[PDB]
Amino acid sequence: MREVISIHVGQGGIQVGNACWELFCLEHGIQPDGQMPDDAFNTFFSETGAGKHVPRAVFLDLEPTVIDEVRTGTYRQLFHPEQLISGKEDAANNFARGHYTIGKEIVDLCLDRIRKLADNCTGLQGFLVFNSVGGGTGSGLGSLLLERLSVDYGKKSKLGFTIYPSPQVSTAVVEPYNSILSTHSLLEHTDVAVMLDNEAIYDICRRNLDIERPTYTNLNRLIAQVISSLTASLRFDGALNVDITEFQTNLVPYPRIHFMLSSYAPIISAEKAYHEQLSVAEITNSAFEPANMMAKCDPRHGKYMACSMMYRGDVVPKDVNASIATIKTKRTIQFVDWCPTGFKVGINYQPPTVVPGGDLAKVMRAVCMISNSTAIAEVFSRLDHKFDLMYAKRAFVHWYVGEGMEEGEFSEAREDLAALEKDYEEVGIET
Amino acid sequence: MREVISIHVGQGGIQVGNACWELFCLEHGIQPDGQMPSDGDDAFNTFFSETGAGKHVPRAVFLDLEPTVIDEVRTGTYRQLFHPEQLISGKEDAANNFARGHYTIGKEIVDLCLDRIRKLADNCTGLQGFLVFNSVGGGTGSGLGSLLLERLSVDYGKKSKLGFTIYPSPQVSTAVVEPYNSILSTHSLLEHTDVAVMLDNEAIYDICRRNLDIERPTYTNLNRLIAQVISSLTASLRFDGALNVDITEFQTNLVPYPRIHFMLSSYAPIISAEKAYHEQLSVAEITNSAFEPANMMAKCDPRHGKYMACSMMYRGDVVPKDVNASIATIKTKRTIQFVDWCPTGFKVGINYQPPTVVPGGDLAKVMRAVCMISNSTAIAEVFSRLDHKFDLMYAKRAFVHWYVGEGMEEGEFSEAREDLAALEKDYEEVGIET
Amino acid sequence: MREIVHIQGGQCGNQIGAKFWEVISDEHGIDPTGTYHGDSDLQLERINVYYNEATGGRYVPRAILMDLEPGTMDSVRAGPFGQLFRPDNFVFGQTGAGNNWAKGHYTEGAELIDSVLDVVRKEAEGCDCLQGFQITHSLGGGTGSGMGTLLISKVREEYPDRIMETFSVVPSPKVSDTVVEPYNATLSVHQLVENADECMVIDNEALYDICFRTLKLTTPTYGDLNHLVSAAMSGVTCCLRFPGQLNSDLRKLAVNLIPFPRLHFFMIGFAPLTSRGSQQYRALTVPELTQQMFDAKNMMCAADPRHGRYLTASALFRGRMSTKEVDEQMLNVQNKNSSYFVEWIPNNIKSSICDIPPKGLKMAVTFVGNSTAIQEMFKRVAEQFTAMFRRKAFLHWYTGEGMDEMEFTEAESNMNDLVSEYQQYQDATA
Amino acid sequence: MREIVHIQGGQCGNQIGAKFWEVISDEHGIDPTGTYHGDSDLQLERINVYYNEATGGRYVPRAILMDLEPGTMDSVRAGPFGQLFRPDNFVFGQTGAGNNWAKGHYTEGAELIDSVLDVVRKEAEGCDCLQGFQITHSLGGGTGSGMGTLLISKVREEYPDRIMETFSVVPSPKVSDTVVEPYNATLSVHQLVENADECMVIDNEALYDICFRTLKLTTPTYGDLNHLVSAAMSGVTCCLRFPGQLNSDLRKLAVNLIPFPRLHFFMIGFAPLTSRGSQQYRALTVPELTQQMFDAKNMMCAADPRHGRYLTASALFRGRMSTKEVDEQMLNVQNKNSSYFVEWIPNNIKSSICDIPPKGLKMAVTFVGNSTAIQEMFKRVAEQFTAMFRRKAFLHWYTGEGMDEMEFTEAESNMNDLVSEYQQYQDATA
């Protein structure tokens, strides 16, 4: 009787959203048609009364090609026909269009579809939202939807899986603008944010997976695996179960600080997978390796606020405890002074699944960690510097002002980043 | 529950490592693909690591800045043994330039190499020490070797390190600049290695020609001898013996002073099957061939100096009482003389596993063998001639412009000369009588 | 959805458009009689963007052919794929402009503009959701420059929220085919800078160089020059008709490429172009594309892009490829050649990937770059304008149909002010 | 992956390259159509050093053919293995130099060389990790001697840390082909000593002597001379392409052979070389190979090494052999010829072993030696040059297009300084 609703807005969210659904359907044995050939599917799916199951998800976009691609793909018979919301005119990399010009006539239908799904559920745990942050409808609609849901539902937990721009590799030129404006919205309206920039995921594919030409198809499979590990405790019995509500109560020291970065292990191709044993003692070491961070950040430049790692497979409670004590012995990993213990550990029985046509090798153990560290202050600084250069000469500004946005909205957005950074510096200093 | 990690750097180090790993695999009975045949355990735990089901992985890492030799290993019959990501290769060779391998290129590989070393060491619980192989006359061998030792010292501390270096021969040589990079490498290793062994190439040629009756020895033949020496040295850790000797029972019995840890090697018997079975090869006579001066594996004559200490190992079916009589005979003999402040100068180890014979090799099968590692004051001559060569070269500053322009200052050569002179003075004042 | 109507004017525009409609039809598998004969279903998914459905199952392009004389439209109808055009869309007069901007914009332009604006209004009304307009014409001719820029203002006044394209062939002096080119070219740019949302400049001189140097073919003609331009036109909107990894419709291109409202003059290039005898010696991958992409001679303009600094540049890749290879290359180029790229904006290159390559090739790319070196175009033309206007030569014809010398001075000042502010950002330091 | 590109200049350079590429293709099993038809796997594992991959599974050499007159390259394009080269890489002038260093370095080189720099850049930095450049040319011809050395200068300026190698043909007066040889030879030597990392000297007189005496064939040809030169060139870089007991590349050879920065003029020789009638009367063994190697007549220069002292020597052995035998032979030679080896460089021979011999041979050796005897060539060339320059003969042709007598005086001064510095170490004692 526990349910979670997933929101996929923009092209970045939808394509990542698709990859999540081959994995969820494969775990529970649901065919693409939706008919099974006990009540563990209730977290994501819902019985129709006789036969098929429908996902508890809604796809939002304004540009039809990606949605029409789904509606004609192999999963045409899975999703409900009227929960794939498709528009006519794309936001076109403009935050003002998706928040002031387009989004005013879009949310009303969107909240109707959310309402219909929510009333069907009975034990709604929370919402999951996916959106690339450096885009028009990604941040323009995401900011509007999160604000609306904050007053419609109130205390429900909203988890955000965003994709921030890489330090030097990007596909857009105006993305430093619409990224900053989005921060002021999701800083005060999202309970949990995850750092999932693209450049770091490229490096993992090249080094660990032995892939020399990674593609967006490859990346979304990795992100889908993290989602499964995060919510594995809701639908699979285990020795130590952790609910969705048992993230904020253990990872958020203060309401302002809710930006964490994730890591996954092991990620090894089948060519050299079982050329080594993959013990439980070593997988927890690979999780803490700074190169395996899914975000382009260095944890060695700051302290650790709190750590939460989820184990799935055939691990046993003896070995995590032995491994964790080893980590505290390490000198290169240093925690903040006022937090003596900072690990929250969960253990599950269901091993990770393998998708046909994939890249990851099947293993009997895996670990996924969500770590809160002060080192994440670097990504805000580097994006802040990029915004300062362009806004110095008011480049690209006339595009935003013409779409109903005020001139001074940038100024109040810039101050929030400066306010946010000083919070991280203040927390890190020992007493 | 005892382990050891072996490091191979440079072409010569990789070549000798290939032979020694073939020898270890043959001795422990593992197929070249890593799978145990057919179907008494933990005999391989010293060198290998179980994957949990079937095959094994060696506790080694291969280093080089040029892929010509490395890619051979990934393609040969042993392509299934080594882990694919511990055979580390570069793109541009140091080209017999110490400066290139210590200041320009070597600083881009050392981080990855140390990461691999950590990934190997965190999976072991009783590491006695490190084994490092390198040829000193090459650029990357001297450069990356010195950088590796410098980083491992600070990163680990008191863990023992054993370096089986190969100094250039007195008159036989391959390169022309190799006197230069020997001095800097020696200065680097002096205060960073715990035990060093001298294995110059010219002596091994003489041993082969005289004993195995080979009139055209090749690098393949030499590597087998060094592999057998390593096997004899390390068999006491992984095989049951009557009088066991661990790795840590070398730095308590062989080096009287911290600065004096350069020592020679000798192996016996080395004999071919055509004349192996014409004598009984008793323990009484094999120990004489060990101390025979022309049988020393380094081109140094112990008759020109005193003996400091001697740690020597036996394997086969040797009996402890038989060893004592031979030691007494050697001490009675007058041609061999020890320092006065060392009344007892023998450390003897006895093991039960006979020396395994490699098929297609050169040595025959013998029930007994002895490996001798001695420390003596006679080693002072090898540095003096190399000092003279370096002085002759550096008198008018030849080949120096190939080192200055790669980051090394002019005065670096002067400091190493002072270190060598101080080292020679240290041997002289140690060897003087009271 | 998000469809666009095509309107072409003048002799040069009609020839450009006729070849363009031939290129599009082959991509969608449309026979010269308007009957679909394709093989893949993807060719029919987004056909409503360019084509209109008629009873009987045939497709008709939503193109409007406007000109002043029937001479050229006799030629376009007899050519291949000429049967597609609807006879109702042929709007034209009988007199002719005679390479006179005054005649093509004030006297004969006024009386014929009602008919052409009526048929345009009908087509824009019929479609579901309009995306914008694209226009092909020449700035040296009377009809193309005269009614061409006049129809811009009338359409913009009625559809202020839609986008507008102009594929303009500016007159180069090295190969000049009209003695009065500087006059009607200067007056057109003045009106074009105020209304057109995107302007793309083409040279006949540059296209001649490409044929002689890259393709290395013996006897090129206007049939081949039109082909190079037509390939670029279809590559810009390819992601609007086909699925892709990073689809980026035209509105997204305008936002990324235009820093300031008055700087919207781009230069186009296409790749890969190879000679027939040397097409089996090269390797076709992502790297070899971006080398030809950024080369100076591959551009379709006489202006040297290395004499100035790129403000922003864009690329559109067609085919199956890896995004990591594309993204690293754009960063990699921008780091080795940091001198040619303006400093006060970081990562000034945008990239897109479309999954359907052009027919006959496995990979292709279209490069659109807004460079500060385009100032050489206006400077050199303005020198010719001030030379002839000082002596009042050829001016009695223009003053004969209502214009006065005050307008000529106003136009020259606006262009001279355009270059001043366009070069101003070249030397700007961060 | 540590590959080396090829640039050939002048008629002599083109003739050298047209045979070198044939030799390399024969060695690596590449058909004249560019399709691999080899016999083992070792022939393809390091093929990337000299070749590039194109679509269709064919290989193309990474060579750049530059010259001033199209006759030579038209001749070499129609010959066997002439279809391998990419037709783009052909760059040619229209007028030629006419055996004039001034024309080849100032008046046509400046105009043409931009394109060849563009193609050299493209080929060089399209590689994974460049190893260096190698150039073939002659110092007796105007266009080669001038444009090639200007190319050397610009390439060295753009790539300061790469390896530069040149196979130079020095004109001899005994068999003279041009009356203006001393001028351009002196100028080329002056411009080359400052830039080139490695230089080797080849003499047609010595080639004729070898062909007449050792091979004992009645009528040698430029084909035969180019064949010997090609074998010598392949011998140096075989070790970079094939595995061996002791691997050693160009940088290692340069470091071990160059004592002082300005002493980089070597002489080479090859062994074994036996006539057809006496080919099997000999026995391929290391002592015979090394004695024929160190034979003074076998060297490819008229400079007799017995008139001076070897600073260093290098020997690259190809085949399977015993390193103990190789070292023993080297030591024996160095002890038996103590007079000809300068004493303050003990053990002054470098040795190498490569397991893959040349096709058709079981054992072969490439020798590179730096001996103090080459100063005789410099002295004789300087004497002829100063004899001609005393009376200002042929001076107006060189001075008519930019140069003055001051540069000739500077060239004489630098040439004499090189001679004095290089003979200084001949009599030096320890």
Ligand SMILES: Nc1nc2c(ncn2[C@@H]2O[C@H](COP(=O)(O)OP(=O)(O)OP(=O)(O)O)[C@@H](O)[C@H]2O)c(=O)[nH]1
């Ligand atoms: N991880 C991942 N990121 C993607 C993918 N596709 C696009 N992105 C990111 O999305 C960013 C730009 O947004 P778009 O994907 O173009 O679409 P959008 O965010 O919905 O904004 P619009 O273009 O207005 O629709 C890029 O910088 C990419 O980093 C994807 O398939 N996987």
Ligand SMILES: Nc1nc2c(ncn2[C@@H]2O[C@H](COP(=O)(O)OP(=O)(O)OP(=O)(O)O)[C@@H](O)[C@H]2O)c(=O)[nH]1
């Ligand atoms: N024992 C033994 N020594 C070797 C062998 N090969 C090379 N050496 C020694 O190595 C020295 C030169 O170094 P190399 O082995 O050629 O290569 P390196 O040490 O990696 O140095 P670089 O050539 O710069 O890469 C020589 O003086 C030899 O004494 C071998 O096969 N066996």
Ligand SMILES: Nc1nc2c(ncn2[C@@H]2O[C@H](COP(=O)(O)OP(=O)(O)O)[C@@H](O)[C@H]2O)c(=O)[nH]1
């Ligand atoms: N690309 C291309 N350009 C053309 C063609 N025909 C003419 N032109 C160019 O158009 C210019 C003259 O335009 P013009 O015919 O006067 O335009 P109009 O007065 O509106 O008909 C000349 O400079 C030509 O270079 C063609 O078929 N293709």
Ligand SMILES: Nc1nc2c(ncn2[C@@H]2O[C@H](COP(=O)(O)OP(=O)(O)O)[C@@H](O)[C@H]2O)c(=O)[nH]1
């Ligand atoms: N070894 C060799 N030398 C050649 C060949 N052809 C010409 N030469 C030499 O090159 C010199 C003339 O060079 P030249 O043709 O003027 O060179 P260019 O001016 O660069 O074209 C003569 O002295 C010849 O000895 C050849 O095929 N092989």
Ligand SMILES: [Mg+2]
């Ligand atoms: Mg989009």
Ligand SMILES: [Mg+2]
């Ligand atoms: Mg080496």
